[PDB]
Amino acid sequence: MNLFQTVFTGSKQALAAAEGIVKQAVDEKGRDYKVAFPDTAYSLPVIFAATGKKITNVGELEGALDIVRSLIVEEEMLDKLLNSGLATAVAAEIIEAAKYVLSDAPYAEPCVGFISDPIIRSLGVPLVTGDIPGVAVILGECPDSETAAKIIKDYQSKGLLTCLVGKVIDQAIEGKVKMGLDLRVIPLGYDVTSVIHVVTIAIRAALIFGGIKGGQLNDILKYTAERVPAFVNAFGPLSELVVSAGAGAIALGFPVLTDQVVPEVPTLLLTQKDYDKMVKTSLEARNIKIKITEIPIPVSFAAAFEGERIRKNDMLAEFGGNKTKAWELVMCADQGEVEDHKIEVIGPDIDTIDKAPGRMPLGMLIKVSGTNMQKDFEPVLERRLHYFLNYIEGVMHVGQRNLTWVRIGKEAFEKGFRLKHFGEVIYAKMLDEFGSVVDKCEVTIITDPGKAEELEGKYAVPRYKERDARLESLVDEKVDTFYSCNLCQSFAPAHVCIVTPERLGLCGAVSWLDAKATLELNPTGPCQAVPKEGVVDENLGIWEKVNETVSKISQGAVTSVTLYSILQDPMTSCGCFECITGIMPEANGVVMVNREFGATTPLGMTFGELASMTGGGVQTPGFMGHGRQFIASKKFMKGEGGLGRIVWMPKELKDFVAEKLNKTAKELYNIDNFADMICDETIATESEEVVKFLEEKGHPALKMDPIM
């Protein structure tokens, strides 16, 4: 008997039991006798959910058997199997409804039977806020009472609401599990049909919290699959009826886990014989994450302890700097190579220190695995490491990559701080802040002189080089999605930043990769995706989708923008920029001013006047604000010819940018030493003097087409 035939057989047995018990209700109470569940507004929830009909008398309960019959179509296709599972759920509900008709109180304690609506509203709020991570539906019998008690109390200690059906109720009592609604251990009943009492909880969750009307079965099934984190643990031998009821749980999107050999279906029906891993298997199968409320460390962890520098007198241990070599790395790896909450230390700890301030290499290696995690997100998490270590009093971390510079105070040594607490804090904060993309985290602390250097060579430097190469080689043509940021709309209401691989956010801190990471980690945030659709002018940088997104985000203040041109429909500026590019028509070029440059320019206005003229989210042709990195870009003023228009620049800015500016000018059409031809404040700050220097220096801006 295959899976489909087992489910069909179970549904028919459920139908046979429903018909028999309905016949008893008709013979003893008549078709006019009332049918109801204690304290509910949804009548029989499963039938109300599936059909929208409320059943009030016994005669209608007998007419509900046709719903079960119409749901059993014996054709071996997945949809029929799910419908047959729902047939068992409807039949089980009819059996439970007839129980209340036949006997006034059909459940005796500890069994609670039906769960009233006020209880659902009572536990509904923890279900939405995640205070209840999931619902563990445990039915059947474990090999021994202690095995059941261990699994049940494991779910209970994790905050999950566990419901019990069958002999596990007695096994848990023998195992001394404290059962209650406040204790989140609810025994429903000894019969298999009592599992419908937790099914109606998920059904009424859609009815009450999802606001889905009765009869919208597909919407209700969609709701329970996405919103109700329920799963089934079926222990002991499974009859056909149990399997068909499990098909009902699968029909609601609840995966079924069992210790029995079954025809496994990936993500839906799974066999796990190891009772020591059943809880972890179920949490993974239902995508349930338990929040570590506290970091198991003796030293205090808080944000208020950031920036408290400990001096040489307070210091015990020191890592990195010129004293020795230290490095940190966050790398993405497959789930097999990472172990959850695996904190190991290679080499000696700080307890072996002579009690004098000592030097020893420190290698920090954090492997992170997840479904949504990719390599481009590795640097972002790594930056947060700087903060995660700084929130611990007694330790301070500054620097990045192999420039790690860490100090640990003597007071941390007294309180009981060791190198394992580094890993504990890192794991806790990685799972807290980055729970969206990080599923498993492994932290490794290395202190050996040899192993630290071997791991730095094997892992750290190749990833640093590949990150630098990816930052260098990314261009607007390869990608097909830019990113819009509106963070600076709090003071520039019409300003929208468009971030491309070659055009940074003009604040200088938001990049294309940073924007992608923000969009992934923080939806409904400052950064949103802008598809590259409706290209109009690739030389100028005009897309129909870009104009549409700019019009939407700026609330209609700015309608059409141009990414690569300064004079035709330019981008707006907010006020966080460090550099301002303005047009100089007499030199047939553009001058550049920096925030730190307080003197005058060839253009006349100083930076403050240029900042007042340019910023504020207003499209001002001929002027723009940007960072220091956009100067040496390929797309810098691409619409007006390129960066050959740069004719004046402060000496400090020129000295900072000269290497990449010369590289890009050498690619453009010019001798490498393009920095020397650009004027500066030392040579001349005046119109005619700058023009004379440019024309005597053979500046390319004097040989191009007129800029306006």
Partner: protein
């Protein structure tokens, strides 16, 4: 000349608060506030009065003289306010649950809220403290206890937006206030978070921030202008919910309002300055696009009601 007749493609949604014949509707306007020449204003702005569970020790002496015999009992205070001034709604602020000041279990505040709500027919607005952690539990208990009256829960900020959303709209069929701070984008974010949770635009109102006149008032004015223009001009669906501004929370705690005449002899009557501050703040925010205001002094309530009546009619 040609009459200026720019049309709007958006319309503010309507939210109903309370039960019975006293239930009030907020929103529905298709034009700017009081622009009866441009089109229709869906509902008249509503004015509510503020009461506390504990005795208002920090309030000015004239206000303690007005409520000298009822301020001890929140139920008597609410009944007195309803019988004497008949506001559109009553705001019951649970300041006894503030963790920084006197701290109370959520059960006691929920009991007080239930006692108040089962004695009045006017819609009730239950406002918590500024602490999000306290607010989540407090509003869960209050919404459980005060079930069936369609109350409004204030300050469902992002940090607890789920909890107040779940214990409020979803579970006990109440309304909620999504609160942000002087930012249109944060208001959009909180509205989108409420919508994704499963809560429609007909189930909550917005609080884009409130301030007294002279203390960051221009930021509130600009935020109100921006959200109104985006909701109506741009047909921004995520900003088309009504806005409630608690005026007496901030306008009555400033030096100009709260200084006694003996403290500043040149300023004059303390009650007049308090009423003037309340009226000015409420008038400005009403002109900028707020739909409901919470006022403390009954004279301010009367003046603002007459102001609304004169402008709309």
């Amino acid at each position: 000349f040609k009459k200026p007749t720019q049309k709007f493609s958006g319309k503010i949604g309507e939210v109903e608060i309370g039960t019975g014949e006293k239930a009030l509707k907020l929103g529905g306007e298709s034009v700017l506030p009081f622009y009866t020449f441009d089109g229709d204003t869906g509902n008249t702005p509503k004015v509510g009065m503020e009461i506390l569970d504990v005795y208002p020790e920090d309030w000015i002496d004239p206000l303690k003289d007005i409520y000298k015999d009822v301020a001890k009992d929140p139920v008597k205070w609410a009944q007195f306010v309803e019988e004497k001034y008949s506001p559109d709604f009553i705001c019951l602020r649970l300041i006894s649950a503030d963790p920084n000041g006197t701290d109370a279990a959520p059960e006691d505040c929920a009991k007080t809220a239930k006692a108040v709500v089962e004695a009045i027919k006017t819609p009730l607005v239950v406002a918590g403290t500024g602490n999000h952690e306290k607010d989540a539990k407090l509003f869960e208990k209050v919404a459980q206890e005060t079930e069936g009256h369609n109350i409004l829960l204030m300050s469902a900020v992002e940090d607890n937006y789920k909890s107040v959303g779940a214990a409020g709209v979803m579970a006990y069929n109440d309304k909620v206030v999504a609160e942000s701070s002087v930012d249109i984008n944060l208001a959009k974010q909180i509205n989108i978070l409420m919508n994704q949770l499963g809560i429609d635009n007909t189930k909550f109102v917005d609080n884009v921030g409130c301030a007294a006149g002279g203390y960051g008032y221009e930021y509130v004015i600009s935020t109100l202008d921006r959200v109104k223009l985006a909701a109506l001009g741009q047909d921004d669906k995520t900003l088309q919910v009504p806005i409630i501004s608690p005026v007496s929370f901030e306008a009555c705690k400033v030096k100009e309002a709260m200084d006694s005449e003996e403290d500043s002899p040149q300023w004059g009557s303390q009650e007049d300055r308090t009423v003037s501050m309340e009226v000015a703040t409420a008038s400005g925010v009403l002109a900028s696009g707020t739909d409901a205001v919470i006022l403390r002094h009954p004279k301010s309530v009367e003046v603002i009601r007459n102001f609304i009546k004169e402008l709309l009619g």
